[PDB]
Each structure stands twice: as structure tokens, then as C-alpha cells.
Amino acid sequence: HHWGYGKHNGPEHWHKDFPIAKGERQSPVDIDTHTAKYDPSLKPLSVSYDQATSLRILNNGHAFNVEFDDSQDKAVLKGGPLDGTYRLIQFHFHWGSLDGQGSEHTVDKKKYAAELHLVHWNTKYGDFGKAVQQPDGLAVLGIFLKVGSAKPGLQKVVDVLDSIKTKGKSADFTNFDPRGLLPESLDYWTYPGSLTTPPLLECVTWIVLKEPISVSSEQVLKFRKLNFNGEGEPEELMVDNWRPAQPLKNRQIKASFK
Numbered sequence: 001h002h003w004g005y006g007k008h009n010g011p012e013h014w015h016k017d018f019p020i021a022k023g024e025r026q027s028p029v030d031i032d033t034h035t036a037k038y039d040p041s042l043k044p045l046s047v048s049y050d051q052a053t054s055l056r057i058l059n060n061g062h063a064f065n066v067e068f069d070d071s072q073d074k075a076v077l078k079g080g081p082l083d084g085t086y087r088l089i090q091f092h093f094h095w096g097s098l099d100g101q102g103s104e105h106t107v108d109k110k111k112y113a114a115e116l117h118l119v120h121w122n123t124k125y126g127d128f129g130k131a132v133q134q135p136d137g138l139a140v141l142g143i144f145l146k147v148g149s150a151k152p153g154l155q156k157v158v159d160v161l162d163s164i165k166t167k168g169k170s171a172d173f174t175n176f177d178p179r180g181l182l183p184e185s186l187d188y189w190t191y192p193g194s195l196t197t198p199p200l201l202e203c204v205t206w207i208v209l210k211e212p213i214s215v216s217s218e219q220v221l222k223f224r225k226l227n228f229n230g231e232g233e234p235e236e237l238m239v240d241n242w243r244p245a246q247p248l249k250n251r252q253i254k255a256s257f258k
């Protein structure tokens with residue numbers, strides 16, 4: 001009876017093993033565009049991915065993680081609301097059973113078909129395990145997906161999924177360039193929050209891009225052929241692996257843009 005996204009182990013149950021589920025800075029949240037205030041003091045965001053080294057893609061039974069070499073400062077996020085240097089460790093997605101849901105963050109209650117999370121750790125804490133124990137430990141870049149024109153830079157991800165169908169399967173995933181997954185604009189919302197899966201630690205500076213990327217129906221259909229289950233177990237399609245919006249509580253969402 002491990003946590004997951006089913007009727008018996010889904011987000012409404014998580015607080016039993018992880019009481020911080022009902023904490024003061026949980027994610028995701030609804031971004032109310034009429035409430036989020038332009039902050040003229042936010043610096044522009046610095047996304048430095050030219051030296052990024054992808055290694056591996058893993059079905060962890062909740063999502064698939066594209067993992068990067070984070071042993072030196074190769075792929076980093078700086079500026080915006082951040083102090084210092086945050087190293088890219090992995091990216092993954094959350095997605096729906098259908099195009100009308102799947103994002104974790106919502107915009108004026110609108111759900112996107114999917115949401116990309118590029119997870120970075122603060123290099124002043126030395127390792128990822130120590131960073132998650134700190135309020136400023138992680139920076140997650142959130143990007144909404146909508147369904148329309150294919151995203152070319154996502155296709156190398158889509159075409160390896162056949163090979164990692166079930167929990168615990170991985171494959172070599174070298175030389176993938178995450179710059180191919182960004183929108184044109186780096187206009188963003190920011191607020192302090194948490195991991196959106198157990199252990200739900202309150203260690204994240206959230207940076208959610210305003211401009212979604214387009215992916216094709218055929219691309220997201222291939223996300224929905226993945227399995228939550230391990231090899232030879234009853235097939236549970238990997239769909240609706242999103243946590244719903246949490247109470248904002250004592251928090252301000254700041255906009256990078258007028």
C-alpha cells in the first residue's frame with residue numbers, strides 16, 4: 001500500500017504517511033492572474049543548458065525521469081528570484097488521461113494537458129539530499145503543455161518510451177538537449193512551495209513559465225501508453241499522475257512581467 005494516484009493511495013491519502021501534505025507551503029497551487037503582482041525587482045531568468053549532459057531515462061512508477069550529470073556545474077538555473085546557482089538533476093512530466101487535465105499548477109483554474117518540471121538543486125548545500133532539507137534547496141522550472149503542433153525537441157523522449165514501459169525499467173539517454181523543450185518567452189510566475197510527490201518537502205522556489213509549449217496528440221498519447229506497474233503485473237496505464245491545487249495560505253505569487 002505505497003502512495004500513488006489511484007482511488008485508494010492518491011493525493012487525498014498522502015497526509016497519513018506524510019503529514020506535511022497539509023503544511024503551510026504545499027504545491028501545486030492555482031495561479032490567479034488578477035492577484036499575482038508584477039515585481040519590478042525580479043532579475044531576468046538565466047537558463048544555462050548548452051553544456052547539459054543527459055545520461056538516462058527511468059520509469060520510477062510515478063513518472064519517467066530524464067537524469068543529468070550533476071557532479072559539476074554544467075546545466076544551471078540562475079537569476080530571477082534565485083540567489084546562487086542551481087544544478088539540473090532531472091526533468092519529468094505530469095499528464096492526464098485526456099487533454100482537459102494533467103497539469104499540477106493551474107492558471108485561473110485552467111488545467112493544461114501536461115506539465116514539465118525541470119528540477120534543480122542549490123549547489124551551496126553540496127548534494128541534492130542536503131538541498132531538499134533547506135527552504136531554498138530546490139528550484140523547479142514549470143512549463144505547461146497544450147496539445148496542437150508537435151514539439152520537435154520532445155520526439156527523442158517520445159520514441160524511447162516503448163523501451164521503459166514498466167516501473168524500474170531504464171535506458172541510455174545521452175546527448176538530449178533540454179533547450180528543445182522551452183517556449184520562446186521566459187516570462188514567469190514565482191512563489192515558495194514544495195515537492196508535489198511524497199515526501200512533499202517544503203524546499204522549492206517555483207518558477208512557472210507563462211507561455212506553454214505545444215505538443216501533438218500523438219506525442220501525449222505515447223505518454224499515456226506507459227505503465228505504473230512493473231513488468232508482467234496487471235496493466236495500470238500511467239495517466240493522471242498530477243496532484244491537484246493546494247491552499248495558497250500566507251503566500252504571494254509574483255509575476256516577472258507587467
Ligand SMILES: [Zn+2]
Pocket residue numbers: 092093094117196
Ligand atoms: Zn513534477
